[PDB]
RNA sequence: GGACCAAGGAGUCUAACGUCUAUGCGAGUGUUUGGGUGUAAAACCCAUACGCGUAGGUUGGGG
RNA sequence: UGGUUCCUGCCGAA
């Protein structure tokens, strides 16, 4: 009801309509009834956010708007939910449907983006991975959330290796991912050991096994397999993080 | 595009973001009268831009 | 490829209503076919002449 | 050798006829009330068609005379013969529906 | 105020250019010694 | 109403708004995307160095 | 560069002087003392379309056409069209000398009084 | 023969530019085959029935291959059962397009095909049976 | 074959099969006899018919 | 029977 109106307001030619609608979404996402809604409403909301990004003129508003979309994932964390139980909450399931609709809409609308239009969506995906991993760190990697965020999000669409997914999206994943973990961790050698310890706090060694599975399947594309094997598997940071 | 209106020279910027609305299409920047400073301004506003 | 277009008043300003694209604008643009059809259509309103 | 240059023109003239005749016939339709009639010739015997006129006996079964029915705009053929039941009945229903929808000025 | 950050396409092309330049420079450094050995062998063979 | 869509029918008898043979209108976007740019050998000087 | 021309003269039809009805354009006949046109006389591709000044000519009708030669001043040279009225030719000349573009034909339909 | 498409479809020339960038910058013979197939005439691009496609999918080891048709994929109602597979081509008749979608498969354009298989990994190319 | 010169002056149109190419659709395809419409010999829409077509193995072998 | 209207390039017999 209000959701499709939010989509229309975000997909407006007027800038101020889109700004005020986004500020209203900041109040709207922290609500019960949107958490009650199925994934189709999340999908509509993400395509509205996509066209909300699509009019962002200068690169500093692009960076601001990408940071705001990071804050959108930052909304669905309550400090109570980390304290109460290791099991999932309904806020967390709404976050799962939220991020899941994000990657669905993004992998759909990926191939229509202009080469001039591309880099703001690239930085968007960078901020979104930062935000979702920040949600994981806020929950401090509860195993329910970790497993379901692997399966229903990452193993579901982007890291599936399916031909339905375009190759450039996991290539962009294996570009940003190493830098994103280091963003989570924050002379140089003390920095290295703090990074090492704080990285051993993290369950990332499970996450790299998805890429191991991706390289293992031979029906997968040899390009993405080969680039993961060349870039990611030859990283020095994994050796410093015992991976 | 460097382009002059009656006296002052303006840098005109065109973004794909404003493919629609061609009245609001061109962005205008007043260039400095210092030749060096205005070339520096060009290199600033065309940062991460093609050669 | 934007979703919708702001209607404009007779006084001329962004009316708050907007309309989605009719998806006809997503059609393929084939100027060869437009040319070949245009020649034959322009040959329609012709009166004959003779000696 | 002849070329139909007037194909665009004559149609216009014909609709002028279809205008002008209609002017004189202002409430009434231009065409009469024709029968729905199944075609001969086994290639076409599943096809139904517009016929010329009904018959005397059918118009009597409709409940009026053909001499009066020509004034009502119902085309009547004497030399046709009604030999199929369903053709006859469907055309009787057609006549009844035509009777239902007319209003006649005294 | 806020720093304009490099577009990611430039970063990917940057990584590719750096890896490519290292491969070409390493190969050319091998070529120099190899061409030296060729010149010595050809000196020997023509003697 | 006049031309239809994938949602509205056509209002023309048996007409469909016709399809594309290529989905993305920009070829240079596809060429410079990421993954073609992964799969491709390094390029030349883009003008030939004349030797001899 | 150094413009080679490969043929100074013109290419005339055989027996073109012998009759007044026969033109001087090249028409293929269907001794060898007549120079016949062929692709060997085609000029060098860098040197092609160059004035003795060393520019490429460009016809200019009005000021908007003159402004198209703004960047390529040293390569091209503006030539005023034959049918430009004398009010417009002086405006074109003032604009061109402001732009610093060599006009191939100044002083056409014009004089300098006082 | 032809070193260029004699057609003037703009989108076709776009695909020619894309596959000539591939056929220069790849080492697989695949894109060279695709480039040579793009030049072909309408007679030299005979249509491929979806029945012939399914009969081709009856080959061993082909069920996880993708199929590529430089030409038109046409429908045939003489088949009932059509497998869930991925077909890339130039043109799709709406009957054959509904056959592929209705079988859960996928109707692909050749740009998306180049994106999925730049080196032609795991593919099939089918040619229509020319008689005249 | 020629006194000279000017202008004019000679593979056009149509019909029937045929190849090739391009284009649209595709086992279908073909609006324009005709009707509706119109800013009116244009464009736009199209009912019923009709026309033409449709109704295993081995060896290799592009990849 | 006689005549049969612009250029250049490429291929080019009996």
Swiss-Prot record, chain A:
It is found in: Nucleus, Nucleolus. Keywords: Acetylation, Coiled coil, Nucleus, Phosphoprotein, rRNA processing. The modification N-acetylmethionine is found at residue 1. GO terms for cellular component: nucleolus; nucleus; preribosome, large subunit precursor; preribosome, small subunit precursor. InterPro entries: RRP1. Pfam families: Nop52. GO terms for biological process: rRNA processing. Its main location: nucleus. Present with 6960 molecules/cell in log phase SD medium. PANTHER family: NNP-1 PROTEIN NOVEL NUCLEAR PROTEIN 1 NOP52, RIBOSOMAL RNA PROCESSING 1B. Required for 27S rRNA processing to 25S and 5.8S. Belongs to the RRP1 family. This is Ribosomal RNA-processing protein 1.
Swiss-Prot record, chain D:
The keyword Protein transport does not apply. GO terms for cellular component: cytosol; cytosolic large ribosomal subunit. It is found in: Cytoplasm. Its main location: cytoplasm. Keywords: Cytoplasm, Phosphoprotein, Ribonucleoprotein, Ribosomal protein. One of its GO terms (molecular function) is structural constituent of ribosome. The keyword Ribosomal protein applies. GO terms for biological process: cytoplasmic translation. Belongs to the eukaryotic ribosomal protein eL13 family. Component of the ribosome, a large ribonucleoprotein complex responsible for the synthesis of proteins in the cell. The small ribosomal subunit (SSU) binds messenger RNAs (mRNAs) and translates the encoded message by selecting cognate aminoacyl-transfer RNA (tRNA) molecules. The large subunit (LSU) contains the ribosomal catalytic site termed the peptidyl transferase center (PTC), which catalyzes the formation of peptide bonds, thereby polymerizing the amino acids delivered by tRNAs into a polypeptide chain. Present with 133000 molecules/cell in log phase SD medium. Component of the large ribosomal subunit (LSU). Mature yeast ribosomes consist of a small (40S) and a large (60S) subunit. The 40S small subunit contains 1 molecule of ribosomal RNA (18S rRNA) and 33 different proteins (encoded by 57 genes). The large 60S subunit contains 3 rRNA molecules (25S, 5.8S and 5S rRNA) and 46 different proteins (encoded by 81 genes). This is Large ribosomal subunit protein eL13A. The chain holds residues 22 to 127 of 199 of the full protein.
From Swiss-Prot, chain G:
It comes from the Eukaryota. The keyword Ribosomal protein applies. The keyword Ribosomal protein applies. One of its GO terms (cellular component) is cytoplasm. Transmembrane segments: none annotated. One of its GO terms (molecular function) is structural constituent of ribosome. It is found in: Cytoplasm. SMART domains: Ribosomal_L32e. Its main location: cytoplasm. InterPro entries: Ribosomal_eL32, Ribosomal_eL32_CS, Ribosomal_eL32_sf. One of its GO terms (biological process) is cytoplasmic translation. Keywords: Cytoplasm, Phosphoprotein, Ribonucleoprotein, Ribosomal protein. It holds the Pfam family Ribosomal_L32e. Belongs to the eukaryotic ribosomal protein eL32 family. Component of the large ribosomal subunit (LSU). Mature yeast ribosomes consist of a small (40S) and a large (60S) subunit. The 40S small subunit contains 1 molecule of ribosomal RNA (18S rRNA) and 33 different proteins (encoded by 57 genes). The large 60S subunit contains 3 rRNA molecules (25S, 5.8S and 5S rRNA) and 46 different proteins (encoded by 81 genes). Component of the ribosome, a large ribonucleoprotein complex responsible for the synthesis of proteins in the cell. The small ribosomal subunit (SSU) binds messenger RNAs (mRNAs) and translates the encoded message by selecting cognate aminoacyl-transfer RNA (tRNA) molecules. The large subunit (LSU) contains the ribosomal catalytic site termed the peptidyl transferase center (PTC), which catalyzes the formation of peptide bonds, thereby polymerizing the amino acids delivered by tRNAs into a polypeptide chain. This is Large ribosomal subunit protein eL32.
Swiss-Prot record, chain H:
The keyword Glycoprotein does not apply. The modification N6,N6,N6-trimethyllysine is found at residue 36. One of its GO terms (biological process) is cytoplasmic translation. The keyword Protein biosynthesis does not apply. GO terms for cellular component: cytosol; cytosolic large ribosomal subunit. It is found in: Cytoplasm. GO terms for molecular function: RNA binding; structural constituent of ribosome. There is a cross-link at residue 102 (Glycyl lysine isopeptide (Lys-Gly) (interchain with G-Cter in ubiquitin)). Keywords: Cytoplasm, Isopeptide bond, Methylation, Ribonucleoprotein, Ribosomal protein, Ubl conjugation. Its main location: cytoplasm. It comes from the Eukaryota. Component of the large ribosomal subunit (LSU). Mature yeast ribosomes consist of a small (40S) and a large (60S) subunit. The 40S small subunit contains 1 molecule of ribosomal RNA (18S rRNA) and 33 different proteins (encoded by 57 genes). The large 60S subunit contains 3 rRNA molecules (25S, 5.8S and 5S rRNA) and 46 different proteins (encoded by 81 genes). eL18 interacts with NAP1. There are 2 genes for eL18 in yeast. Component of the ribosome, a large ribonucleoprotein complex responsible for the synthesis of proteins in the cell. The small ribosomal subunit (SSU) binds messenger RNAs (mRNAs) and translates the encoded message by selecting cognate aminoacyl-transfer RNA (tRNA) molecules. The large subunit (LSU) contains the ribosomal catalytic site termed the peptidyl transferase center (PTC), which catalyzes the formation of peptide bonds, thereby polymerizing the amino acids delivered by tRNAs into a polypeptide chain. Belongs to the eukaryotic ribosomal protein eL18 family. The gene is RPL18A.
């Amino acid at each position: 009801m209000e959701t499709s109106n939010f989509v229309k307001q975000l997909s407006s030619n007027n800038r101020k309509t889109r700004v005020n609608a986004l500020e209203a979404l900041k109040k709207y996402l922290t609500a019960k009834q949107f958490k009650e809604n199925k994934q189709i409403e999340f999908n509509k909301l993400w395509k509205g956010l996509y066209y909300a990004m699509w009019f962002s003129d200068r690169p500093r508003p692009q960076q601001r708007l990408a940071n705001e979309l990071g804050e959108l994932h930052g909304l669905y964390f309550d400090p109570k939910d980390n304290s109460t139980a290791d099991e999932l909450t309904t806020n967390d399931k709404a976050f799962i449907k939220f991020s899941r609709g994000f990657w669905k809409v993004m992998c759909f609308e990926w191939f229509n983006i202009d080469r001039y239009r591309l880099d703001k969506y690239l930085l968007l995906i960078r901020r979104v991975l930062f935000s979702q991993l920040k949600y994981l760190q806020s929950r401090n990697w509860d195993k329910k959330l970790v497993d379901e965020y692997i399966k229903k999000v990452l193993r579901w669409l982007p890291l599936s290796g399916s031909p339905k997914v375009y190759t450039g999206i996991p290539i962009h994943i294996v570009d940003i991912l190493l830098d994103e973990w280091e963003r989570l961790l924050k002379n140089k050698e003390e920095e290295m050991r703090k990074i090492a310890e704080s990285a051993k706090k993290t369950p990332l060694a499970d996450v790299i096994a998805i890429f191991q599975d991706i390289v293992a399947d031979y029906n997968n594309s040899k390009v993405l397999r080969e680039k993961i094997k060349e870039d990611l598997f030859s990283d020095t940071r994994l050796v410093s993080w015992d991976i | 595009t460097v382009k002059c209106d009656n006296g002052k020279l303006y840098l005109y910027m065109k973004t794909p973001e404003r493919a629609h609305t061609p009245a609001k299409l061109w962005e205008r920047i007043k260039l400095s009268k210092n030749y060096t400073k205005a070339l520096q301004q060009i290199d600033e506003h065309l940062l991460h831009w093609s050669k | 490829s934007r979703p919708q277009v702001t209607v404009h008043s007779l006084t001329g300003e962004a009316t708050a209503n907007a309309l989605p694209l009719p998806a006809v604008f997503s059609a393929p643009i084939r100027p060869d076919i437009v040319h070949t059809v245009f020649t034959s259509v322009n040959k329609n309103k012709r009166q004959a002449y003779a000696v | 050798v002849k070329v139909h240059f007037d194909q665009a023109g004559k149609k216009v003239s014909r609709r002028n006829a279809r205008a002008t005749r209609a002017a004189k016939i202002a409430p009434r339709p231009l065409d009469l009330l024709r029968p729905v009639v199944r075609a001969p010739t086994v290639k076409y015997n599943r096809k139904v068609r517009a016929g010329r006129g009904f018959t005397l006996a059918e118009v009597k079964a409709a409940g009026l005379t053909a001499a009066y029915a020509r004034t009502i705009g119902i085309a009547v053929d004497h030399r046709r013969q009604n030999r199929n039941q369903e053709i006859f009945d469907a055309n009787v229903q057609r006549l009844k529906e035509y009777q239902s929808k007319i209003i006649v000025f005294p | 105020a806020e720093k304009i950050l490099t577009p990611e396409s430039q970063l990917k092309k940057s990584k590719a250019q750096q890896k490519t330049a290292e491969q070409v420079a390493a190969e050319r450094a091998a070529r120099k010694a190899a061409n030296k050995e060729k010149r010595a062998i050809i000196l020997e063979r023509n003697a | 109403q006049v031309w239809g869509s994938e949602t509205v029918a056509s209002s023309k008898v048996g007409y469909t708004l016709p399809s594309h043979i290529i989905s993305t209108s920009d070829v240079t976007r596809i060429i410079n995307s990421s993954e073609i740019q992964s799969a491709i050998r390094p390029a030349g000087q883009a003008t030939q160095k004349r030797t001899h | 560069p150094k413009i080679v021309k490969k043929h100074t003269k013109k290419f005339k039809r055989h027996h073109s002087d012998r009759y007044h009805r026969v033109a001087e354009n090249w028409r293929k006949q269907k001794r060898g003392n007549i120079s016949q046109p062929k692709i060997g006389y085609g000029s060098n591709k860098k040197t092609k379309f160059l004035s003795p000044s060393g520019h490429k000519t460009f016809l200019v009708a009005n000021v908007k056409d003159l402004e198209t030669l703004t960047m390529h001043t040293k390569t091209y040279a503006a030539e005023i069209a034959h049918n430009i009225s004398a009010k417009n030719r002086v405006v074109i000349l003032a604009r061109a000398k402001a732009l610093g573009i060599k006009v191939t034909n100044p002083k056409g339909r014009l004089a300098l009084e006082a | 023969h032809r070193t260029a498409p004699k057609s003037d479809n703009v989108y076709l020339k776009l695909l020619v530019k894309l596959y000539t960038f591939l056929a220069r910058r790849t080492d697989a013979p695949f894109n060279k085959v695709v480039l040579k197939a793009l030049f072909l005439s309408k007679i030299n691009r005979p249509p491929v029935s979806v029945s012939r496609i399914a009969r081709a999918l009856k080959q061993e080891g082909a069920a996880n291959k993708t199929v590529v048709v430089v030409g038109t994929v046409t429908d045939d109602a003489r088949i009932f059962e059509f497998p869930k597979t991925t077909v890339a081509a130039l043109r799709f008749t709406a009957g054959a397009r509904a056959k592929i979608v209705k079988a859960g498969g996928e109707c692909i354009t050749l740009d998306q095909l180049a994106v999925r298989a730049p080196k032609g990994q795991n593919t099939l190319i089918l040619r229509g049976p020319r008689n005249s």
